[PDB]
Design a protein around this ligand. Sequence first.
Ligand SMILES: Nc1ncnc2c1ncn2[C@@H]1O[C@H](COP(=O)(O)OP(=O)(O)OP(=O)(O)O)[C@@H](O)[C@H]1O
Ligand SMILES: [Zn+2]
Lengths: 191, 133, 373, 224, 256, 84
Amino acid sequence: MVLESTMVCVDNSEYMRNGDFLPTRLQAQQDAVNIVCHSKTRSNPENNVGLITLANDCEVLTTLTPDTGRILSKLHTVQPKGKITFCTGIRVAHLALKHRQGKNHKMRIIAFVGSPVEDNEKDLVKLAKRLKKEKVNVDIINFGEEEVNTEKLTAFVNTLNGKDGTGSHLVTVPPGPSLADALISSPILAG
Amino acid sequence: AVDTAEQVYISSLALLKMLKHGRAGVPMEVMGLMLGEFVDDYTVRVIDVFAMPQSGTGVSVEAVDPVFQAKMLDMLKQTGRPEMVVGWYHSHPGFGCWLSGVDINTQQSFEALSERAVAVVVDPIQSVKGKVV
Amino acid sequence: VPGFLQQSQNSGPGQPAVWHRLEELYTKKLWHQLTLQVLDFVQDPCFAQGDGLIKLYENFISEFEHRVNPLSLVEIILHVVRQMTDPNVALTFLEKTREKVKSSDEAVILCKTAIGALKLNIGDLQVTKETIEDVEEMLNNLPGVTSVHSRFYDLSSKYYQTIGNHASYYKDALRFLGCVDIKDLPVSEQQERAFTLGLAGLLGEGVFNFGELLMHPVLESLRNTDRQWLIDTLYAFNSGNVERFQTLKTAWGQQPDLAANEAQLLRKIQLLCLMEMTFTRPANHRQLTFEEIAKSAKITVNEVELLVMKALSVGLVKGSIDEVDKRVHMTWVQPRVLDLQQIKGMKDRLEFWCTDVKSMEMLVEHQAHDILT
Amino acid sequence: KLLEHKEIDGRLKELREQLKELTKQYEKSENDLKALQSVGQIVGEVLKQLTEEKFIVKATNGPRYVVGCRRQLDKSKLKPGTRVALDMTTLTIMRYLPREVDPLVYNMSHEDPGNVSYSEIGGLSEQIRELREVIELPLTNPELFQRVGIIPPKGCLLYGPPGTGKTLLARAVASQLDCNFLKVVSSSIVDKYIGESARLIREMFNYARDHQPCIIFMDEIDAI
Amino acid sequence: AVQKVVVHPLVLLSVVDHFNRIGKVGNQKRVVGVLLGSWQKKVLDVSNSFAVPFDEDDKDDSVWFLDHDYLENMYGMFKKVNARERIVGWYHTGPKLHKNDIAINELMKRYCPNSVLVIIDVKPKDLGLPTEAYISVEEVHDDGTPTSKTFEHVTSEIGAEEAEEVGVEHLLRDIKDTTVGTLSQRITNQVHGLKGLNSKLLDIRSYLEKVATGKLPINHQIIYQLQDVFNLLPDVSLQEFVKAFYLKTNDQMVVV
Amino acid sequence: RTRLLDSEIKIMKSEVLRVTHELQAMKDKIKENSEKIKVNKTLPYLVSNVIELLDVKCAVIKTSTRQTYFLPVIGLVDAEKLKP
Ligand SMILES: Nc1ncnc2c1ncn2[C@@H]1O[C@H](COP(=O)(O)OP(=O)(O)OP(=O)(O)O)[C@@H](O)[C@H]1O
Ligand SMILES: [Zn+2]
């Protein structure tokens, strides 16, 4: 197989350093990158994977490339510290997917949010009906802690889709002690 | 069949990369490939003389690395335009720049590759503003 | 262990609402709202009685958290040394948190500003040369934290207190004045910081134009609330070398520390003439008299010689000592602060130059217009 | 289990050893790879300076040329006679250079083996002390020969029967002073050519003029 | 760092041809491509560079993209074919800068610790030399803000090379060699009197910008200081140059 | 173990460091080998003579055509291998 492009949106904010999740939150998001990068290894290697973040910057260290062992080397010294701004993370992920190599790739993007973002529901509905006018399905896995039941990104899930394009699957964060594989075991079942 | 009077349009960045390329490798003949656009029969343009990697043992047809053709030309495809090659360049600094035996050795390869396969010959030590080398 | 907050859960009114929550913070193993809770323990309005209790537990937070930044650990060890009131246990703790902490968020300079912050009791001469200088030696990466630059003012200004380089109160004043941006500490202490900023800037005479940058906000808000003449006699050291009411009003109000610098403040008004005579006056007059230098300088005739030669020792001017008539010739000078009327009259003579050279330029081109072809 | 730290230290030790050794070998072949595009230059010599921009040189291989300096060649250093570097193609002066050496001089300069001093020879202490008086005294203290104001001697001719230690005397001085013994064997000078041996004599006398305490020796003059 | 630059017009045409590569397609804002460079001394040189695809949406001026893989692969090509060359910065064709350019600059200062930009104009009529140099350093501030990271106008010039104008002065065909003695002096008269003192009138327009506005950085640091370097000559009425007309007669003396 | 399992994550991390070791080693290795294929396979070699080795790591060459050439850059040898 299937043609797509998935932009991993890691969290590098200063809440992602502790160990409420399995041993390390860096290990939780890191093993999430392991299962999505091996998941795109199991997917079409014509597809491409590139790293982006939301906190303190919108970091393009690697190109949206079919290689991923380089990103496996980019798992090191991620240093999660900064201030979350995911609202520009949608747009930087999207023009990141508007400088692609081919249009036969679909656009299904994952996202890793683990801090209270100053996102208006007006902002994510401008971005959400923007993605209605841009044909992108985004399945978000919430990390860290922002809400025990994420609501604004639920509104982004609802306002992204309608009647045909429900590629908005939201694994809301279990911010207490939950496993590194139990959170990601549901998107590997169904994205 | 019947054959029309041909014509070679330039973009002059051709000539700038010939003076800079042959100026850079000035004690040695160089070999390269010339990019442009096949407009029609009686005209053809050069819009890009681009760098080609060195040979150390022999300036020949083996100076064209095909992975540099895929990588170089493909990264020209993800530059602003994927235009078509119009031939090939080289140099002769050591003398009055006539067609070496290498040129007739690879001319049939270059016209197996292209329709025209027009040579580009230069001595980089001629002039400062005047000669059309 | 939650039993430490079962006994230390009581610190104020309405207090265990954050302690019964705190035993969900670290027992549910989140540590950055507990970084906010170390910020809460810095914040805690009390005698700060539990910090000497919590300090072993915060050492434990550094043990089985092993990721948080020790900025808040310095911010809590100033509270612990405030509670215990002796620096040596936090010198053992200080060298401890200097040898065991190599944290990525500027651990070395928070340790050197911990030596600077806890330097006030260990003496300020044996150690202000080595490690206070080692703060900016270790500031080779990025001088933009402004916490290390404000604390760097603090240790560099204690180095100003233990007297060395009076004239480093100008650049030291560029470290407090170049650290603080918005007021973020009480104005009713800031105007005393501007009070002693003008006093110690008057003691440090290396820049001698101390009314230089005084469109600076977090001093000028204090200039409009302090005594109003002190700024005005710094303007009698900035603009006008007259008004003995002003340059003596700094003897009326400021009694001490004037006669120690009084002949050098005479020197500063005797260069304030040197900006007046060619900055303010029309052109230069090409030849400027002993009555002008001596009268503006309120000095005799036989000191204008030492005045202008001493000005050549300063190097502000390169003037020739025209004293065949005791009437000095001018050269280039270092300027003073451009006032708004200096802007406008500068626009007058400057636009005068602009449209005269441009207009007569077009006239010369009009005479040379017929010879082009 | 807890042997994974030991296996991690083994794989990290072998991986870091292969990275440092083989990647540092890629750094040595990186520098040696960078020096591949360099081209050697021309050895020329300044005949004289024509004008401020025009320079009269003659390279060793043949004809005479007039070119200019580059930008910052410091033209006051161009005295007429210096060895300079020329471009291969542009042929203008690249770099003012020091002098040539002609390593035939070096094959008698650095080929003095070790030796026992003048105590090994005996019975010719007149020649020993007398040679000390004629050589070592004017080079150490010329002012004894300048207080009188008469020129010291320069050249000395050892002669006599074969095998009177005329070689080993100068060899013992060549284990006594140890300064600049240019020992000319004076039979391997001529090879076939015209003024080649002459040019060797000019080089020996100019190098001898340079390194001010030179000691000239010449064995077996009778061949030449 | 930087003393100045040495920039051949060849790399400027290497901006021009990619401006032809984008002028046929939807030009969103401008071109941002690589500036390679030959840095030897504190002076600079550029013999070549290349470009790279780039868009930017103007909502937070932070969504903007180059391809560093493309940059280092074609940089591996050009470094391979020429060991002299390395990256020295970037360029942009829209002649006015904006706020994102510090994110472009500081995002590509990771490869080399300087990344100089180049302002050019594809349709220049008013500027002098097109080329321009900044450097992104700090003078902190007088108030000492949190890292006022500032572009600094390093002086810039058109570079030169032997036998590079072999094309150029044969192409243009219009050059009148050695117009000394005829009208070149009055070309420079009109353009320096007019085009110098109009810049003086825009600086006095900026002085009025300090009158009605201009409190941002009123700039009482460099303006009156180098304007006192200008005020080496206070040329007021009555003109005060009695010590300059026998000087003028000495100047007129030998020539007449 | 937990430090043993994180040490096993450091073992796979050191395996990624071994992948970077073979990458930076073998990649730039075989590339610079190919540049030595270009330079070192120029099998007609004019032999010559070393005149001097200046140090301003420079050498002066007397060819078998009895001519002189300067080089400031020595080449693919060592200065210890170069006696006069
Ligand atoms: N006086 C001496 N003391 C010590 N050893 C001596 C003495 N004379 C000769 N010998 C030894 O015998 C060797 C013979 O001397 P040698 O022949 O080299 O001198 P020479 O200058 O060559 O004489 P010639 O050239 O006329 O045959 C010396 O090299 C040395 O080993
Ligand atoms: Zn050829």
